[PDB]
Here is the input.
Amino acid sequence: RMLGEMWKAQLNQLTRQEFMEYRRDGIIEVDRSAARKARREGNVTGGHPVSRGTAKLRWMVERGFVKPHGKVIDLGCGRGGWSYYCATLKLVQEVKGYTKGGPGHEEPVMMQSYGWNLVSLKSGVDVFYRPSEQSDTLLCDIGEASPVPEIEEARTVKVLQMVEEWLSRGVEDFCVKILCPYMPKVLKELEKMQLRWGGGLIRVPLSRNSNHEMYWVSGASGNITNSVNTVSQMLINRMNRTNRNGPKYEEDVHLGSGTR
Ligand SMILES: Nc1nc2c(ncn2[C@@H]2O[C@H](COP(=O)(O)OP(=O)(O)OP(=O)(O)O)[C@@H](O)[C@H]2O)c(=O)[nH]1
Ligand SMILES: Nc1ncnc2c1ncn2[C@@H]1O[C@H](CSCC[C@H](N)C(=O)O)[C@@H](O)[C@H]1O
Ligand SMILES: [Mg+2]
Here is the structure.
């Protein structure tokens, strides 16, 4: 058994009060109070990201793990945090985002962040049955949590099988959420996809301790098993501390306004 399986089992055994004290202990968290207000007041020009996802992709882009450029396709775009962020980037020319929407799913939000006119978000799209398209940059942020690791395993494998089809359509840069990177079917599939397409797995420190999500990104490298175990050991070490401090707060991304 991978160390991550022990982590998931230990996580599920926490009391609710332990879980709540653990999930954000020592992580980085952007202050979203101003953005949440702007969403309630319909402020689309203040530069506030539509979701917490913008800060996560910004973290990866600023360290060179992915380099959005040209035509960007954003699979599972939700409200559009990754898509609007990419449209602010100089090398990016066009952004197409697809998301399922509907009951219990996030709907695309229309924003006027810098470059908004380059962004087309389409709701009502199940990407698992959508024909693939050409892109220069492929992003995918799909993976619904479950307390059952085999369910997270199956969901992650489906994303990987879907992104295999899209990666063969001319993709130069990519960033794909790996919801459950420690289970055997995911590790087997990731290793084959790393052999074919390269890249490596990274942990964004804005990810909460209540998940083991990692990102398979074209600008990273390194042994996948080692990368996963490193995360698992860090998450277990955090779980086994009693003196909790909550998150380290940082400033959210500013996306500006105006057309490009
Ligand atoms: N012990 C314990 N584990 C939980 C609890 N809620 C969720 N989990 C575990 O944590 C995983 C992530 O749950 P989430 O609800 O997505 O995590 P979260 O940090 O609470 O994030 P948000 O609910 O979106 O604010 C689940 O798949 C479970 O394995 C809980 O109340 N107690
Ligand atoms: N089968 C499917 N087809 C298209 N979108 C899906 C999907 N299953 C889940 N999703 C969507 O994928 C999204 C992942 S959340 C993505 C957050 C985004 N990166 C941001 O920054 O705002 C969810 O909104 C979910 O509704
Ligand atoms: Mg929760």
Remarks:
- Residues 3-27+53-242 form a domain with the Rossmann fold fold (CATH 3.40.50.150).
